[PDB]
Design an enzyme around this catalytic site. Structure first.
Site, PDB file in Angstrom:
ATOM      1  N   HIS A  53     100.249  13.916 -16.473  1.00 13.11           N
ATOM      2  CA  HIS A  53     100.101  13.682 -17.907  1.00 13.11           C
ATOM      3  C   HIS A  53      99.513  14.923 -18.533  1.00 13.11           C
ATOM      4  O   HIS A  53      99.951  15.364 -19.588  1.00 13.11           O
ATOM      5  CB  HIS A  53      99.201  12.490 -18.178  1.00 13.11           C
ATOM      6  CG  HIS A  53      98.764  12.376 -19.610  1.00 13.11           C
ATOM      7  ND1 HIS A  53      99.154  11.335 -20.429  1.00 13.11           N
ATOM      8  CD2 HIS A  53      97.955  13.163 -20.361  1.00 13.11           C
ATOM      9  CE1 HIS A  53      98.619  11.495 -21.622  1.00 13.11           C
ATOM     10  NE2 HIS A  53      97.891  12.597 -21.607  1.00 13.11           N
ATOM     11  N   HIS A  93     100.916  18.409 -21.137  1.00 16.66           N
ATOM     12  CA  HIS A  93     100.239  19.205 -22.164  1.00 16.66           C
ATOM     13  C   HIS A  93     100.335  20.682 -21.869  1.00 16.66           C
ATOM     14  O   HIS A  93     100.599  21.465 -22.770  1.00 16.66           O
ATOM     15  CB  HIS A  93      98.773  18.835 -22.253  1.00 16.66           C
ATOM     16  CG  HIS A  93      98.540  17.508 -22.874  1.00 16.66           C
ATOM     17  ND1 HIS A  93      98.984  17.202 -24.140  1.00 16.66           N
ATOM     18  CD2 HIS A  93      97.894  16.414 -22.424  1.00 16.66           C
ATOM     19  CE1 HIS A  93      98.631  15.969 -24.442  1.00 16.66           C
ATOM     20  NE2 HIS A  93      97.971  15.467 -23.415  1.00 16.66           N
ATOM     21  N   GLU A 125      99.944  14.338 -28.684  1.00 18.80           N
ATOM     22  CA  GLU A 125      99.339  13.379 -27.769  1.00 18.80           C
ATOM     23  C   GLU A 125     100.178  12.114 -27.633  1.00 18.80           C
ATOM     24  O   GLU A 125     100.286  11.582 -26.558  1.00 18.80           O
ATOM     25  CB  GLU A 125      97.920  13.011 -28.215  1.00 18.80           C
ATOM     26  CG  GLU A 125      96.804  13.701 -27.424  1.00 18.80           C
ATOM     27  CD  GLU A 125      96.452  12.989 -26.059  1.00 18.80           C
ATOM     28  OE1 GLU A 125      95.315  13.281 -25.558  1.00 18.80           O
ATOM     29  OE2 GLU A 125      97.286  12.176 -25.502  1.00 18.80           O
ATOM     30  N   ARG A 144      98.941   2.225 -18.241  1.00 22.73           N
ATOM     31  CA  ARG A 144      98.714   1.468 -19.477  1.00 22.73           C
ATOM     32  C   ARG A 144      99.931   1.430 -20.369  1.00 22.73           C
ATOM     33  O   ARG A 144     100.793   2.289 -20.278  1.00 22.73           O
ATOM     34  CB  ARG A 144      97.578   2.074 -20.264  1.00 22.73           C
ATOM     35  CG  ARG A 144      97.740   3.555 -20.534  1.00 22.73           C
ATOM     36  CD  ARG A 144      96.422   4.271 -20.237  1.00 22.73           C
ATOM     37  NE  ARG A 144      95.368   3.746 -21.113  1.00 22.73           N
ATOM     38  CZ  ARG A 144      95.010   4.293 -22.287  1.00 22.73           C
ATOM     39  NH1 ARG A 144      95.591   5.423 -22.736  1.00 22.73           N
ATOM     40  NH2 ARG A 144      94.040   3.714 -23.018  1.00 22.73           N
TER      41      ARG A 144
HETATM   42 ZN   LIG Z   1      96.859  13.579 -23.401  1.00 14.60          ZN
END
Ligand SMILES: [Zn+2]
Ligand SMILES: [Ca+2]
Ligand SMILES: [Ca+2]
Ligand SMILES: [Ca+2]
Ligand SMILES: [Cl-]
Lengths: 1289, 15
Positions: free
Chosen positions: A229, A233, A267, A369
């Site tokens: 994850h 970025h 994000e 999630r």
């Molecule tokens: Zn993030």
């Protein structure tokens, strides 16, 4: 293929794969870190990230760094060489896991190959400059003890150990002089602080089915996914596309609103799934365009670069070519680089919508999630990621060999207990809100900030829609879909660079200029006072301290707050007594069963005490459990929801951003017909874009201000049910342990079984709760959000219509023979709204399903639903139509209303203009019940010939009306030209006994693309083709009022009027009929409620033309033949109804009591009647020896030779007004004697002989009543006819 | 209570 290098922390420094690095934020000031080259361009420094943090802040304190994170501190992490080694080997293992599938390998390959541009915004276009901190990092290559000698290396990523908060992993980019290369197309060295064993926990409260057994118990994260994850970025940063734009900012201006940092679209893109839908199409395009311009900057630099001022060993053409490849630019024959808009669009979409956490988890079979915005549980420690019994490169925790592949069992806190440890809450810091009770040292509830409601601030959303647009012949439409086919990513053989990386070696960095962010903790508690008692308070009241001994349930929220032994509960008054019931030893096991069971039943309540209500899903105890929204715990919640819907649950009603769409300026093309038509076509295409963008804007707001509130409500209900369970478990355990040690041996009880039984009942309840709340959420969107946007979109359309029409007329000269083809292109196109589809704006299957469930619930198609709820009709539909009932309209609480002949006997409905728009292709239905009086015998031609309107919806001489002409009921549609269509239903008026005259029946009219239809009582009666008319304006006021040429005496009764925005199917209509026919009470002949103490004539469904008369000489009921209409008229005929004896139903008891005069099934009655100025009674002989016998009718007496007790029955399960009358031994017994009916009997004997009908009891009927379908014609089927103003004979 | 009067009549109706 990507290779992961191997090494040990203590391996010698080789100045090549193991170096001493001077990392960007160390600032050339001081100190160096042993760094390890895990793959090309990526380095691991297994040490705490200290930059911008104070040493003290590595300890747990009374403060926190961020307000969401449950924060774990351990200042000793990474304080030895061996720990540092474990870190290294875990990272190697994680890297290996990542590259174990193509998708992940490709992520790494993209990252490895996406070298930062040799410069940033300060650098001349004609220069590469490597001597900046975003590009070059230094390695110290001198020996220990010697004068420092440095050489520079190019790098892409440096991964550190955690900062002070171990579980808060973070990717960071390099700002110099207040700008960021990695946000402006160039990219730069990316940095990460990461911790592999302290992983996040999440649950899946909010999804159903779910898990064959062990949901919803909490799951821990696979640190490979956490790592990837963050690597996403890094990916965005290296390609310089990590850009800022309008963020999501929480509204923070009430105590119950969650406070959090601003959220960049990047994000939400990184997470993926449903979260990109919170970023509006407006902002999606805004980001896209920014990145495109940024890339135009780089391509231009590439066409201009000539020299490298800082490293003479750099080869300009080598780097020009690597960057061409990185950014997917194309090169012409002259060597000029340009942007190919397709390669860009693919690269963009793959980088932002391809590589997402949601997609990787799916591909890797890792659970994660459901949203950036989901609740969190506290972090856990993964004992040993280096143990392949627990975690492996190939399968993470979910190891099929240990039966942990199915349902991500290997991540389940309740199954894979041996994989993780909880962290002592001494080390955890969390931002809390301490809510202390005030009214208009006390009680103070601590609530985690992150348990509060996330509501996006209105400034979160772009109003670009309000800008003007310039429509040219070549104007194009822009749609950025947030989706990327993940299997094509995996198989794109052009994605990964085939160009060799240039050498990582360069000249030393001497310009250390860089911005180092500075971090400080803030207090972990914020104290506030509030008068409010909403979700957090209601939940708190359901808890209890550990050291107590003898808790009891209560329904008094206040008592629960005051007393430690009192715990609040939202189940029935009655659950609550059983819960609190103290029993003897022998009865205990039985009680434990009952109460565990009662709990499960209570938790499963999913229907709605009143059955006509028009609500599909409800869970009735939600109000009492949370008091969320508008005082949902006070008053009957079901009732409150009926009146006001999903809104009553919302703690905050957000204000929508709904911009006025900007005007179009259509460009002119003197002398080019082809360009004029294209400008028209482009204008219409752009109109669709504005509709779509607007819907997309509503959806963004819906998901981040409403659906979030509902999510929080789901979690609350998960906790509340769990608290109720926990309480009962404690009650049971306490009571058990009071018993003598011997008593306890002869009491068989399993606490793990009890526990799992309750745990099941909660998961059943939460499925229902999910469905209800999800439904509520879509409902708010569709009723309170979308229509307000459609209002402005229609304005826009109407302004564009004028605009395009004026334009066609100005350019008519060049539209030589096409002007009227184009006028009708525009008019036809802009005549129908663009329909709203949620799947355009997301491909989260959860949301899409929510939306499909809604749209296929017929009750959600109701756009008008008039019901009585307080003296008064009101619209329960949810669309808030204004309803004015004038004084001449009679209303009762049976929902009936009477329109009379008076001027003031009218109702005016003012429809919601924003949902009826649908208007050339009709697709709507109208339903109601009606009671139309019998004709007047002497005024027969006015009846037959005079038409009067009863309901009228016309605007500008167009719309629809229901009218009546005597025995005919008529539906008419009238189009904008006055062209007319009709369909009608006519009931007979020459029938002995009519099923329609002056009796409630149910009408449904449905209109579709080619048919208007009338149904009566569920059955299709007639039908008219309506293709041949035009636009019908169906949004006028609806006026309920008698309008024609009619007598003072004329009136009409109606109930349950409603309008659906679709054509109801036969099934739908038959359902509604059955539904609206249902009653606790029995009904009289006319369809009104059956009543005690009220004169009734008797009618027999099996002998229509027969009536009861007390025989003259005798005490028995003879049957006679109803007189016919006796007069000249050939237009009408009927049988008299007001004949035979005047019966009256009396109550056997009235006890216990009750309290109103309505007769109900299974009631015990006396059937009496009036004779000679007295009240007589219908009995049966106790001991009749045949199968049928004459009934005995005689004055009132308690003679022990006759049963007088009658139970009143309704054996027919389909709608009916017939009932039956069963004679019983007494009120106590189950023995059934016979049913009242009519039978023929033999009359003796020496005179003349014959059979003759009598009021009787019969055993034979009882043998048929349970048959199906129930025979409506059986002679034991009776109906009671009271005098009525609607029938005169 | 002239009701046995009626009873008897009833009993003769059914017989
Ligand atoms: Zn993030
Ligand atoms: Ca979006
Ligand atoms: Ca929250
Ligand atoms: Ca308490
Ligand atoms: Cl029954």
């Amino acid at each position: 293929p990507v290779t992961i290098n191997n090494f040990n922390y203590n391996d010698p420094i080789d100045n090549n794969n193991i170096i001493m690095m001077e990392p960007p934020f160390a600032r050339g000031t001081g100190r160096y870190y042993k760094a390890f080259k895990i793959t090309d361009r990526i380095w691991i420094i297994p040490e705490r990230y200290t930059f911008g943090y104070k040493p003290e802040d590595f300890n747990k304190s009374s403060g926190i760094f961020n307000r969401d994170v449950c924060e774990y501190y351990d200042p000793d992490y990474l304080n030895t060489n061996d720990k540092k080694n474990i870190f290294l080997q875990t990272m190697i293992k994680l890297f290996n896991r990542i590259k174990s599938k193509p998708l992940g390998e490709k992520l790494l390959e993209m990252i490895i190959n996406g070298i930062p541009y040799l410069g940033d915004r300060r650098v001349p276009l004609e220069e590469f400059n490597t001597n900046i901190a975003s590009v070059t990092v230094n390695k110290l290559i001198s020996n220990p003890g010697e004068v420092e000698r440095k050489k520079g290396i190019f790098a892409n990523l440096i991964i550190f150990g955690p900062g002070p908060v171990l579980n808060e992993n973070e990717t960071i980019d390099i700002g110099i002089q207040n700008h960021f290369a990695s946000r402006e197309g160039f990219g730069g060295i990316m940095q990460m602080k990461f911790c592999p064993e302290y992983v996040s926990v999440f649950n899946n409260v909010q999804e159903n089915k779910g898990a064959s057994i062990f949901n919803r118990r909490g799951y821990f994260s696979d640190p490979a996914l956490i790592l990837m994850h963050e690597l996403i970025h890094v990916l965005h940063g290296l390609y310089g596309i990590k850009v800022d734009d309008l963020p999501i900012v929480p509204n923070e201006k009430k105590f119950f609103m969650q406070s959090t940092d601003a959220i960049q679209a990047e994000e939400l893109y990184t997470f993926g799934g449903q979260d990109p839908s919170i970023i509006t199409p407006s902002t999606d395009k805004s980001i896209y365009d920014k990145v495109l311009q940024n890339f135009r900057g780089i391509v231009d630099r590439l066409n201009k670069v000539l020299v490298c001022i800082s490293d003479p060993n750099i080869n300009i053409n080598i780097y020009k070519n690597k960057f061409k490849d990185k950014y997917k630019f194309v090169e012409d024959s002259e060597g000029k680089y340009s942007i190919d808009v397709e390669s860009f669009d693919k690269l963009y979409k793959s980088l932002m919508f391809g590589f997402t956490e949601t997609n990787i988890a799916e591909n890797y079979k890792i659970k994660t999630r459901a949203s950036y915005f989901s609740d969190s549980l506290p972090p856990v420690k993964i004992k040993n990621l280096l143990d392949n019994e627990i975690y492996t490169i190939e399968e993470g925790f979910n190891i099929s060999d240990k039966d942990m592949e199915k349902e991500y069992r290997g991540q389940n806190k309740a199954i894979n207990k041996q994989a993780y440890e909880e962290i002592s809450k001494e080390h955890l810091a969390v931002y809390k809100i301490q809510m202390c009770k005030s009214v208009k040292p006390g009680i103070c509830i601590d609530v985690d900030n992150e348990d509060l409601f996330f509501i996006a601030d209105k400034n979160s959303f772009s109003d670009d829609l309000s800008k003007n647009e310039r429509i040219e012949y070549n104007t194009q439409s822009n749609y950025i879909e947030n989706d990327f086919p993940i299997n094509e990513l995996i198989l794109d053989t052009d994605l990964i660079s085939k160009i060799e990386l240039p050498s990582e070696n360069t000249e030393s960095l001497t310009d250390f200029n860089v911005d180092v962010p500075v971090y400080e903790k803030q207090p972990a508690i914020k104290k506030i006072f509030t008068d409010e008692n909403t979700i957090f308070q209601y939940l708190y009241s359901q808890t209890f301290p550990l050291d107590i001994r003898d808790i009891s349930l209560t329904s008094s929220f206040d008592d629960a707050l005051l007393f430690s032994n009192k715990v609040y509960s939202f189940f029935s008054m009655d659950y609550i007594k059983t819960a609190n019931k103290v029993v003897e030893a022998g009865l205990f096991a039985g009680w434990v069963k009952q109460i565990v069971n009662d709990f499960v039943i209570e938790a499963n309540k999913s229907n709605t005490m009143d059955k006509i209500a028009d609500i599909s899903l409800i869970v009735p105890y939600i109000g009492l459990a949370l008091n969320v929204g508008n005082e949902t715990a006070k008053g009957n919640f079901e009732n409150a929801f009926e009146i006001a819907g999903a809104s009553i649950l919302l703690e905050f009603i957000p204000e929508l951003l709904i911009p006025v769409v900007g005007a179009f300026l259509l460009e002119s093309y003197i002398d080019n017909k082809n360009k004029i038509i294209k400008t028209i076509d482009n204008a219409l295409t752009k109109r669709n874009e504005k509709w779509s963008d607007m819907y997309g804007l509503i959806v963004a707001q819906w998901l981040s201000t409403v659906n979030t509130q509902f999510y929080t409500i789901k979690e609350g209900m998960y906790k509340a049910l769990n608290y109720q369970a926990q309480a009962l478990e404690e009650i049971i355990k306490y009571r058990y342990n009071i018993y003598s040690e011997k008593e306890k041996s002869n009491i068989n009880i399993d606490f793990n079984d009890i526990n799992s039984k309750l745990n099941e009942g909660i998961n059943q309840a939460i499925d229902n709760i999910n469905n209800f709340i999800n439904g509520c959420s879509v409902s708010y969107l569709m009723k309170k959000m979308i229509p307000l946007a459609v209002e402005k979109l229609l304005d826009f359309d109407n302004t564009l219509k004028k605009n395009l029409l004026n334009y066609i007329d100005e350019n008519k000269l060049y539209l030589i023979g096409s002007a009227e083809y184009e006028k009708s292109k525009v008019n036809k196109y802009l005549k129908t709204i663009m329909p709203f589809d949620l799947s355009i704006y997301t491909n989260d299957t959860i949301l899409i399903e929510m939306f499909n469930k809604y749209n296929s619930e017929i009750l959600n198609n109701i756009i008008l639903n008039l019901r009585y709820k307080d003296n008064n009709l009101i619209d329960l539909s949810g669309y808030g139509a204004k309803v004015e009932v004038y004084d001449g309209v009679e209303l009762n609480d049976k929902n009936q209303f009477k329109l009379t002949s008076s001027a003031n006997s009218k109702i005016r409905v003012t429809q919601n203009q924003n949902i009826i728009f649908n208007s050339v292709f009709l697709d709507f239905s109208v339903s109601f019940w009606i009671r139309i009086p019998k004709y007047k015998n002497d005024g027969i031609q006015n009846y037959i010939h005079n038409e009067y309107t009863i309901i009228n919806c016309m605007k500008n001489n167009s719309g629809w009306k229901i009218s009546i002409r005597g025995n005919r009921i008529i539906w008419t549609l009238i189009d904008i030209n006055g062209k007319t269509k009709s369909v009608f239903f006519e009931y007979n008026i020459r029938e002995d006994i009519s099923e329609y005259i002056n009796r409630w029946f149910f009408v449904t009219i449905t209109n579709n693309l080619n048919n208007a239809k009338i149904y009566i009582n569920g059955k299709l009666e007639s039908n008219t083709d309506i293709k041949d008319i035009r636009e019908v304006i169906a949004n006028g006021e609806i006026i309920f009022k008698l309008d024609g040429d009619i007598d003072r005496t004329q009136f009409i009764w109606m109930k349950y009027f409603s309008i659906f925005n679709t054509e109801l199917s036969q099934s739908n209509i038959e359902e509604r009929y059955k539904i609206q026919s249902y009653s606790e009470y029995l009904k009289d002949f006319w369809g009104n409620p059956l009543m005690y103490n009220k004169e009734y004539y008797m009618f027999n469904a099996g002998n229509k033309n027969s009536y009861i008369k007390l025989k003259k000489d005798s005490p028995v009921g003879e049957i006679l033949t109803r007189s016919k209409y006796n007069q000249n008229s050939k237009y009408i005929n009927y049988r008299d109804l007001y004949i035979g004896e005047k019966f009256i139903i009396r109550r056997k008891s009235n006890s216990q009591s009750i309290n109103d005069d309505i007769v109900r099934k299974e009631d015990y009655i006396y059937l009496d009647f009036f004779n000679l100025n007295q009240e007589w009674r219908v009995y049966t002989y106790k001991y009749f020896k045949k199968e049928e016998e004459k009934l005995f009718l005689a004055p009132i007496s308690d003679s022990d030779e006759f049963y007088n007790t009658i139970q009143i029955k309704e054996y027919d399960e389909q709608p009916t007004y017939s009932c039956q009358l069963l004679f019983k031994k007494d009120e106590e017994s189950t023995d059934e004697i016979g049913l009242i009916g009519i039978h023929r009997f033999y009359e003796s004997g020496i005179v003349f002989e014959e059979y003759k009908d009598y009021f009787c009891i019969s055993k034979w009927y009882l043998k048929e009543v349970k048959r199906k379908p129930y025979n409506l014609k059986l002679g034991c089927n009776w109906q009671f006819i009271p005098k009525d103003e609607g029938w005169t004979e | 209570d002239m009701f046995a009067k009626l009873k008897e009549k009833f009993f003769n109706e059914i017989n």
